[PDB]
């Protein structure tokens, strides 16, 4: 069947959700839901349809102003100039990541990436699912924590009015004190993008069994 995808904000302020999906064939929404503090909304994956697959990114654009089509714009993860889905790529933020694909016994998998940035805390956990006894798979991928207050000085971004909202990677391709202070604070995310190499790590997760999945962004402020 479909999997679904909740989005929960507890970030303390407005997110504008928006997407990017691999050039593969996975289909993008035609529209992200706009969702104040505490509130919620529920997407379902066209894992049914054409291509039987769905490979992309979800993320929370914050400190959004302005008029969609003209002058529309985010102070986090802006990827184009309207409220309601992605124009452009996005600028770095924290991101959930996920594989859904029909034809892969072992998916959907699903992961946290704070390879581009640290903006807000992510968690991903999946929704109704049968572990297998024995089995730790349908793990639940980043943690709650905001991490902002960890960041280099050196990679730390400001709302105009002074506010700490974004820690930016400066490589993501190599081990840095940003990889570091994030790794060494959530090992459940990718910090860089070859953590996924490194023995021990805890980058990555699946779960063949379940409806859906959470995806809660939390406090950052």
Not at 2 to 8: G, L
Not at 14 to 43: C, E, K, M, Y
Not at 98 to 108: H, Q, S, V, Y
Not at 213 to 219: K, L, P, Q
Request: charged share 10%; net charge negative.
């Amino acid at each position: 069947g479909n999997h679904t995808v909740t989005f929960v904000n507890h970030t303390g302020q407005t997110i504008w959700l928006g997407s990017t999906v691999n050039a593969d064939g996975s289909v993008n929404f035609a529209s992200l839901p706009t969702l104040a503090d505490g509130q919620s909304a529920t997407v379902t994956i066209p894992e049914t349809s054409a291509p039987g697959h769905w490979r992309g990114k979800f993320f929370a654009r914050q400190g959004c102003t302005g008029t969609s089509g003209r002058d529309f714009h985010c102070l986090v993860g802006d990827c184009g100039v309207y409220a309601d889905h992605c124009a452009t790529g996005e600028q770095p933020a924290s991101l959930a990541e996920f594989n859904f694909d029909t034809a892969d016994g072992l998916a959907p998998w699903y992961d946290v990436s704070y390879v581009n940035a640290f903006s807000v805390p992510i968690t991903i956990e999946p929704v109704n699912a049968a572990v297998p006894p024995g089995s730790a798979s349908c793990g639940t991928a980043g943690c709650p924590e905001n991490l902002l207050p960890y960041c280099p000085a050196a990679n730390r971004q400001y709302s105009p009015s002074g506010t700490l909202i974004n820690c930016v990677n400066p490589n993501r391709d190599a081990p840095t004190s940003y990889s570091d202070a994030i790794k060494s604070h959530c090992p459940k995310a990718y910090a860089w993008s070859k953590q996924d190499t490194e023995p021990g790590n805890q980058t990555m997760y699946q779960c063949a069994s379940c409806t859906g999945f959470t995806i809660t962004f939390h406090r950052a402020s």
